[PDB]
Each structure stands twice: as structure tokens, then as C-alpha cells.
Write a protein that binds this ligand. Structure first.
Ligand code: SF4
Ligand SMILES: [Mg+2]
Length: 187
RNA sequence: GGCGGC
DNA sequence: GCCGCCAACATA
């Protein structure tokens, strides 16, 4: 039901901070390192894209990287299809959970994957939070949680703020959950 | 990105 | 250089 020329907006309204960053990095650089391609690609599949849309979405953005639209089909296409279970063993991989994103494959320079509340240093997180136009009160309420290592809670706090609600009404532990609960309120 | 094949 | 096959796992 979801369409491609609708993602840029969705990233702002319903994507949790991690996926939002990942999308922005993708649009600005026209590319993403492995870690991000994994985290974001499966998220996109979790929200609804089909294999046709995924290949389109990724190809389109990588051509802007000015690379051979063939060098794309060469490497990148097979792996996208394998994500959707259409190659090898044929496993329709479930998208990543929070605990996994937070406790594993920590990001390095050049990477945008991971959990902002956990991998972005307090000072850079605050700037992001401010860029998302989050009230200095909640931003302060989030940083606290972060300092207490309650990353998922800090994210729920971010959810409640961009949605103008008192209680998100669910315990967060998976990015696509954050998306669904958001779409519930907006759509 | 890793592992694997030439 | 060319190429294949992997990982995940919430979820009302
Ligand atoms: S808490 Fe879970 S969802 Fe919110 S950002 Fe960290 S990872 Fe993405
Ligand atoms: Mg590569």
C-alpha cells in the first residue's frame, strides 16, 4: 500500500531515529556501507516494500552515485533479492530488533547504522534532536535516559514527542514496531 | 562487510 | 577481476 515517492516524508513522520538517519545518509550520499544497507534494507521490507520496489529504490539512489547501473546489478542486486528470500537457502529475513542494533556491530566512521541513542555521543545526539525540532525539555529528558543507558525508553520518549502524545502506549523493542505504532496515530 | 570458488 | 551465499527472530 506504501509507495516509493512517499518515503522521504515517512522517514520524518514515522521512522524511528535510526532509520531516519539511515535514509537521510542514503539520500545525501547516494550510498550506504554494509551495516546500514542491512539495517535499513530489512526495515524497508518490514514496513511494506516489495522486492520490485526495493530493487528500484536502491538502484535509483545508487545510479546518482554516478556508478555503472550494471556494476549495481553485479554486486548489490543479488544481495537485495537474498534479503527477500529469493536466492540460496531462501530465507525471508525478519528485520533487526533494537537489542541487536544496540548491542552488536557497533558503527565506525562512514557508517550510519546502529542506535543513535546508543552510538551517537551526547553532544551530537543533542544536535540531531534539535534538528528534529524537539523541545529542549524533552531533549534534556532524553539525554538523561541515555545516560542511564535506557536507550529504548529514550526513543519511546522521542516517539511521544514527535506525535504529541502523553504515553506511546507500548514498550519499544523493534524499529518496525515504532513505525507501525506511528502509522496507527497518523494513518 | 564476511566467508567461499576460479 | 569475475561470481555465490549469509545474517534475523518484535508482533497483538
Ligand atoms: S531504540 Fe530501537 S528504534 Fe529507537 S533508534 Fe535505537 S534502534 Fe532504532
Ligand atoms: Mg561491497
Amino acid at each position: 500500500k506504501i509507495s516509493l515517492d512517499q518515503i522521504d516524508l515517512l522517514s520524518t513522520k514515522s521512522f524511528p531515529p535510526c532509520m531516519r538517519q539511515l535514509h537521510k545518509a542514503l539520500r545525501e550520499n547516494h550510498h550506504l556501507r554494509h551495516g546500514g544497507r542491512m539495517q535499513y534494507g530489512l526495515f524497508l521490507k518490514g514496513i511494506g516494500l516489495t522486492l520490485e520496489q526495493a530493487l528500484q529504490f536502491w538502484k535509483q539512489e545508487f545510479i546518482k552515485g554516478k556508478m555503472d547501473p550494471d556494476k549495481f546489478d553485479k554486486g548489490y542486486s543479488y544481495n537485495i533479492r537474498h534479503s527477500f528470500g529469493k536466492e540460496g537457502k531462501r530465507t525471508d529475513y525478519t528485520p533487526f530488533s533494537c537489542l541487536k542494533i544496540i548491542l552488536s556491530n557497533p558503527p565506525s566512521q562512514g557508517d550510519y547504522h546502529g542506535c543513535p541513542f546508543r552510538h551517537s555521543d551526547p553532544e551530537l545526539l543533542k544536535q540531531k534532536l534539535q534538528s528534529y525540532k524537539i523541545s529542549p525539555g524533552g531533549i534534556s529528558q532524553i539525554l538523561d535516559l541515555v545516560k542511564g543507558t535506557h536507550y529504548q525508553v529514550a526513543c519511546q520518549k522521542y516517539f511521544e514527542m514527535i506525535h504529541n502524545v502523553d504515553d506511546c502506549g507500548f514498550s519499544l523493542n523493534h524499529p518496525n514496531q515504532f513505525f507501525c505504532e506511528s502509522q496507527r496515530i497518523l494513518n
